[PDB]
Each structure stands twice: as structure tokens, then as C-alpha cells.
């Protein structure tokens, strides 16, 4: 989950390579999109839409094995100074679009690194972020310019837990080389289903390998395969997707003077063409060119 | 005051220059696409001006490069403007030059006797791209640094002189301070002089032979 | 209106120029001041105003400090080097890549010496040349777009 | 980052014809 | 919308400034 990111990787959700740390556990890749304004004025509230689409009709494997729907999560790394807009500054229309999203910072004084935990994918394939742009006028660390926006979006259950143990939502290979003699399915302490599998035909070790039910097997019985053959499959129907984007912290004064200069240029061009027009008539008269 | 113009006229022969200029004409087949070469020049003059401007604050050192670009963007008066213009005009120069080559080729203007103009043009294209590649890495950010670290090893493929070439370009066995120093000399000293020389030849030949004929 | 001067075909110095395809600044609209003084500043100001406009509305970015120990995801040169970059990464033979790269300017240099076989200027009177040019242009755009895509979608543009 | 690319292409392509049209128009009203 | 109205209105304005300066300067025996 997003909060497992800040647990394992507290300093930042972004590695020096630009790789977002979710990928360290959500090993599959699915498309993630973003929608940010090209430019925004300072001290303004604007919409930042992260999109984590997937096939709603396709379900995934739950912790036990049951076929269940999947949730979405995301991390939105904004530029310095940017942060989630205060509720009193978000218009009604935007409020309705957001929903029950619990925006929380990645850490103390990291208000620009927003994070959004588990949300029902059926209703949140498109997460809206109300964000407030900073103001260079009252913050010497903030200035107008173009800045990056890093976005990680995931759907579906991960593959690794913060401790190291693998989840049941991944593929399972064979332990070693030998003839499979066990498609046993025992249990005991905990609950629900489990499978016991083993091999041999001579070796240098006498142990077996259990697989947490959920994936589903495609191996029958008796076969001297090697160490690495897929004896289950890939139940995973989710995946994590990265994207970079850019936003311009614009200054109204810059654009204003721009409009004026543009107008001056167009005027000058007109006067030049008209001047030529005059000279054309003069040349037509006093034939001397 | 005793006529200053006649004074300058007698020794500069301004009248002769005026006669030479007003003796030229532009034929009907010369359409708007014949501006592209001039626009490429205009883009370069913008580079010359804004580039020079940035040498007053930019510092070609691994310690100071990135921060000097930050300083230009944040602290220097209109520094953000001068740099943004250098950036966009760098790309507009190459674009307009491509469109310029499209005009020249789809008009046969490169054929006898204007083939040295075309060859000097190709050389001008290589120089312009060299401008781009060297400037791209001057900020010494992730993008610029890794753009260099990739291409700087390419020439090693050449059998005998490959490693020597690559060492000359990067200033050593690997990319580092020496690389930044050589790239900066190239971007702000070598390439401006080279492009001036070959632009001089380009323009002298054009003015000598006039524009190619109608299609 | 519309100032024009006809070619003086009674002038053997002009005729000798035209014979060498080289007298086309002797006739037409007066270059000065008609174009030079009046129209040129329109083009200079125009291009300058478009560049400034782009510069203000979409200013230059400054990424993050270089890191020799961390290779970025997404690692491209500037757009005009996409075709060359595509070739360079997609060819297993590094030497052959360097040669293909060098072949671009060297190849363009040979153009005039290859198409001097005739004196035509209009592309409609040289369909073979126009075909080779359109082909290379399409192949270059193809290689350029491929550069921004994964290596697997390069030889197909992820379309088929 | 693709609809912006197509938008910019279409605009840089089509705005030229608008400027061409306006030029021809001004030519008509002056009496070319 | 606002972009389209502004674009057409900007060009229309300056096309009107062009025509205005044209016939305007003609009337004054300047053109």
C-alpha cells in the first residue's frame, strides 16, 4: 500500500533513477496517466487527475484465493510549494468530483508529495487532486518556472510484503530438478487452502515446497522438470505505472507584457506593409528603379 | 555641419554600396519559402545574443554549473527570459534549417554551379547540431549529463583512432569536469567561429551567384 | 502597384550569366527597399515574437543535478537526433552504426554531384529524385518516432 | 502527452492557411 | 471557446486596424 512505501522508504518514494518505489513490490506494469494544467497562476486551486484504468470486469485473487475486485492507489509528487488545497478553497463542483479521498503527506514537511491509499477501483479509476499553487510573492524559496510532476499509479494487490514474504498474487516456480510426486493439499494451524509439492529422483537436499492457494496449478503428476518451471501461473491482473509531467508556475504580469509586445509587433508589421504600399505607387509614377 | 555625410562618402564610397544594393532584384519565383534561410540566420543571431548574455552568469564547472543555471532562472533580471529564448530558438534554428534544406532541394537550387553553397550548408548543419549537443549538457543535470555519457563512447567503435577521438571529446577516459570544459569551449568559442566562417562562405557564394532560377 | 523590371535580354553580360543559370537577381521586384527594408523586418519581428512568446508561456526547465551513479528512466537526446539515435541503438554492430551516422552528412554532400546528371529544378520534372527524397523523409520521420518508443516497437511503431 | 502533440501539429499546420487567407483578403481590399 | 473567440477577435481587430489605416491614410493623401 502507499503507506507501506513510506514505511520501507521513508526518505522519498522516488529513487535517484526516477523509479518510484512501488515497483519494488508491484512487479507488473499497467498504463497510468495524468492530467495537469500546462500553466497555473500562483495561489490558485487547480485539478490534477491521476488515471489508473483497468478491466473492471476482470477480477483478481484475494489473500485467501477468492476471486475479488481490486483497489487503486497513487503517489503524486508535486513541485516545492505545491500542496493539497484547503477544503474552504475548493469549489463545490470540484468537491463532488473528488469523493472520499484521504490525501495524506509522505512525511513531515513533505506536503507536495501527496499520497492516496486504497480506493475502490470500480469508482476510482480516475482520482482527482485539489492542489493549491504557491506564491513567489511571499516565499523566497518559490519562483515562477517550469517544474516536474512525478506520478505513480497502481491497481491490484502487490507481490511482496514489507517483511519479504511473497504474497499469493504471483507466479510459483519449481524448487529443484526432480520428478514431482506430490500435489498434496494439507493445512493445519491457520485456515483456508494450501498445497504441498515435492520432487527428487536423487539430489543433494531432502525438503519440499508449499504454495499458498490462489494462483491455480497447471501440473498434473510425475515429471522430472528443472529448477524454475512454472507449476502455477500468473494470477496478477493489476500492475503499477509511472509517468512524468510538467507544470508552469506562471506569472500574470509576464503574460500581460507579452500580450502588449505581441500587439506592438503586429502594429509595426502593418505600418511596414503600408509603407511599402506607398513606395510602390511612387515607383509606378516616377519610373526609376 | 559642413555635411558629415559627404565626409563619410568620400572615403567609404557609400554611394557605390548603395548602387550595388539597389541593383539587385528578386524574381517572381522567389516565394515565401525563400525566407527560411534568413529565418535560420535570425534564429542564430538570437542565439549569439542570448548565449553571450548567459556567459556573464553561467559557470562551466561541475560544482557551479547547475546552480548557475538556477541563478539565471531565479535571481538574474529576466534571466528566465534570456535562457528560455536561447532554448526555444536553439530548436527553432534547427527546425527552420531543415525547412530551409527542404526548400533548396525541392527547388534544385543546389545544382551547378551552387554545389559549394550546398556542401557548406551541410557543414553548417553539422556545426549547428554540434551547438545543440554541447549546449544540451551545460546545465549538468541528469538529462544533459547522461546525454553525454552515452554518445561520448560511440566513437570507440572506430578500429584504430576510435579511443583517441573519444578521449579528445570527453577530455579523458570518462565523462567529468574535463568533458564540461571542452564542451563549453566548443559551444562558446570553437563553434561560433566555425559557423561564422562557413556562414560567410555560404552568404558570399549566394550573393556572388544570385538565387537559383525558376522551376 | 507591384513594381517589376523585365530581364534585359539584349545585355550579353546578363545572357552569359543566364547561360550558367546565374543571372536571376537582375530582374524582378526591386530587392531594396521593397523586400530588404520593408518585408525583412516583418519576418525578423515575427519569428522573434513567436520565439519570445513560446519562451514566456513555456519557459526552460532545469532538471535535477547530475548523478553519475543513477541512470535515469527515459534517456533521450534532442528531437533532431532521434533518427540517428534510433539507428545507433537498434543496430547490434556499433561500427556499422557509426558509419550509418556519418553517411548522413556525407551522403547529403554527394547529392548535387549525383543529380547534376540533369538540369531540372522542379520536382515534377525529376520523379526519381523526388521519390528517393520522399522515401528518405518518410524513413527519417519513421526512425524519429521509433526513438521515443521501446526498442521492440521500433521496427513497427507499435502499430502492427 | 499525445493529444497536445496532435493539437500543436494541427495548429501549426492550419494557422498558416488562416494567415494566407488574411493576406489574400487584404490584397483584395487594396485592389491588387 | 474563449480561445477561439479571442483568436478570431484579435485577428478581426487587427484586420480592421489594417483596413482602417489603409483607407485612412489614403484619404489623407499619404498613400
Amino acid at each position: 500500500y502507499p503507506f507501506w512505501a513510506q514505511q520501507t522508504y521513508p526518505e522519498t518514494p522516488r529513487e535517484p533513477t526516477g523509479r518510484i518505489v512501488c515497483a519494488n513490490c508491484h512487479l507488473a506494469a499497467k498504463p497510468t496517466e495524468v492530467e495537469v494544467p500546462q500553466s497555473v497562476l500562483p495561489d490558485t486551486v487547480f485539478k490534477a487527475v491521476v488515471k489508473i484504468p483497468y478491466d473492471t470486469s476482470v477480477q483478481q485473487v484475494g489473500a485467501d484465493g477468492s476471486k475479488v475486485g481490486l483497489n487503486v492507489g497513487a503517489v503524486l509528487m508535486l513541485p516545492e510549494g505545491f500542496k493539497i488545497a484547503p477544503e474552504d478553497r475548493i469549489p463545490e463542483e470540484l468537491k463532488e468530483e473528488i469523493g472520499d479521498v484521504y490525501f495524506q503527506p509522505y512525511g513531515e514537511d513533505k506536503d507536495n508529495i501527496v499520497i492516496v491509499g486504497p480506493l475502490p477501483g470500480e469508482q476510482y479509476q480516475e482520482i482527482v487532486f485539489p492542489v493549491l499553487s504557491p506564491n513567489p510573492a511571499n516565499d523566497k524559496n518559490i519562483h515562477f518556472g517550469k517544474y516536474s510532476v512525478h506520478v505513480g499509479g497502481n491497481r491490484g494487490r502487490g507481490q511482496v510484503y514489507p517483511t519479504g514474504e511473497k504474497s499469493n498474487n504471483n507466479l510459483y516456480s519449481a524448487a529443484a530438478t526432480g520428478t514431482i510426486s506430490k500435489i498434496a493439499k494439507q493445512e493445519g494451524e491457520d485456515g483456508s487452502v494450501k498445497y504441498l509439492v515435492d520432487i527428487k529422483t536423487e539430489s543433494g537436499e531432502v525438503v519440499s515446497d508449499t504454495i499458498p492457494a490462489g494462483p491455480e496449478l497447471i501440473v498434473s503428476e510425475g515429471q522430472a522438470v528443472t529448477a524454475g518451471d512454472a507449476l502455477t501461473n500468473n494470477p496478477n491482473v493489476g500492475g503499477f505505472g509511472q509517468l512524468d509531467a510538467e507544470i508552469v508556475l506562471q506569472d500574470a504580469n509576464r503574460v500581460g507584457w507579452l500580450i502588449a509586445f505581441v500587439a506592438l509587433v503586429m502594429l509595426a508589421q502593418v505600418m511596414l506593409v503600408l509603407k511599402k504600399k506607398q513606395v510602390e505607387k511612387v515607383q509606378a509614377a516616377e519610373m526609376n528603379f | 555641419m559642413a555635411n558629415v555625410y559627404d565626409w563619410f562618402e568620400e572615403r567609404l564610397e557609400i554611394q557605390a554600396i548603395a548602387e550595388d544594393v539597389t541593383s539587385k532584384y528578386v524574381p517572381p519565383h522567389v516565394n515565401i519559402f525563400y525566407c527560411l534561410g534568413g529565418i535560420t540566420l535570425v534564429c542564430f543571431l538570437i542565439q549569439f545574443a542570448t548565449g553571450f548574455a548567459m556567459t556573464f552568469y553561467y559557470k562551466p564547472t561541475v560544482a557551479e554549473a547547475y546552480s548557475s543555471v538556477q541563478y539565471i532562472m531565479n535571481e538574474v533580471n529576466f534571466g528566465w527570459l534570456i535562457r528560455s529564448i536561447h532554448r526555444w530558438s536553439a530548436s527553432m534554428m534547427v527546425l527552420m534549417m531543415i525547412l530551409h534544406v527542404f526548400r533548396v532541394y525541392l527547388t534544385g537550387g543546389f545544382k551547378k554551379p551552387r554545389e559549394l553553397t550546398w556542401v557548406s550548408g551541410v557543414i553548417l548543419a553539422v556545426i549547428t547540431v554540434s551547438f545543440g549537443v554541447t549546449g544540451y549538457s551545460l546545465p549538468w543535470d541528469q538529462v544533459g549529463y547522461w546525454a553525454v555519457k552515452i554518445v561520448s563512447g560511440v566513437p570507440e567503435a572506430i578500429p584504430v583512432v576510435g579511443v583517441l577521438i573519444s578521449d579528445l571529446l570527453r577530455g579523458g577516459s570518462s565523462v567529468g569536469q574535463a568533458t564540461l570544459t571542452r564542451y563549453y569551449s566548443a559551444h562558446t568559442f570553437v563553434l561560433p567561429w566555425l559557423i561564422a566562417v562557413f556562414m560567410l562562405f555560404h552568404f558570399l557564394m549566394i550573393r556572388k551567384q544570385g538565387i537559383s532560377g525558376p522551376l | 502597384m507591384a513594381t517589376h523590371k523585365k530581364p534585359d535580354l539584349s545585355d550579353p553580360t546578363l545572357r552569359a550569366k543566364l547561360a550558367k543559370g546565374m543571372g536571376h537577381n537582375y530582374y524582378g521586384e526591386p530587392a531594396w527597399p521593397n523586400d530588404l527594408l520593408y518585408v525583412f523586418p516583418i519576418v525578423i519581428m515575427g519569428s522573434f515574437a513567436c520565439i519570445v512568446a513560446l519562451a514566456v508561456l513555456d519557459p526552460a526547465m532545469t532538471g535535477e543535478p547530475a548523478n553519475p551513479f543513477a541512470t535515469p528512466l527515459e534517456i533521450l537526446p534532442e528531437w533532431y537526433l532521434y533518427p540517428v539515435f534510433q539507428i545507433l541503438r537498434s543496430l547490434p554492430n556499433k561500427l556499422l552504426g557509426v558509419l550509418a551516422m556519418a553517411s548522413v552528412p556525407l551522403g547529403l554532400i554527394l547529392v548535387p554531384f549525383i543529380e547534376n546528371v540533369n538540369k531540372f529544378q522542379n520536382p515534377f520534372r525529376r520523379p526519381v529524385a523526388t521519390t528517393v527524397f520522399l522515401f528518405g523523409t518518410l524513413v527519417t520521420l519513421w526512425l524519429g518516432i521509433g526513438a521515443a518508443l521501446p526498442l521492440d516497437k521500433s521496427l513497427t511503431l507499435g502499430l502492427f | 502527452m499525445s493529444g497536445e502533440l496532435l493539437n500543436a501539429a494541427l495548429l501549426s499546420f492550419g494557422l498558416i492557411f488562416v494567415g494566407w487567407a488574411l493576406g489574400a483578403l487584404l490584397l483584395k481590399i487594396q485592389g491588387a | 471557446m474563449l480561445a477561439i473567440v479571442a483568436y478570431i477577435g484579435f485577428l478581426a481587430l487587427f484586420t480592421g486596424i489594417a483596413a482602417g489605416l489603409l483607407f485612412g491614410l489614403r484619404s489623407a493623401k499619404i498613400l
Binding site: L272 | - | I42 | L11, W20, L26, L27 | -
Partner: peptide, 29 residues
């Protein structure tokens, strides 16, 4: 946020208008 839109519009307008003034001044194209 309207000033931003007008900002981009002005770019589109000088591009278009430059074309137009070159066509007018040079009488075609």
C-alpha cells in the same frame, strides 16, 4: 486563468499575422 489562455492565443495570433503581413507585403503566397 483567462490571461493564460489569452497568452497562448497571442502566440497563435502573431504566427498567423506574420504569415498574413508577408503575403500582403509581397503580394501573394
Amino acid at each position: 486563468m483567462a490571461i493564460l489562455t489569452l497568452g497562448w492565443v497571442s502566440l497563435l495570433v502573431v504566427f498567423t499575422w506574420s504569415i498574413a503581413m508577408v503575403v500582403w507585403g509581397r503580394n501573394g503566397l
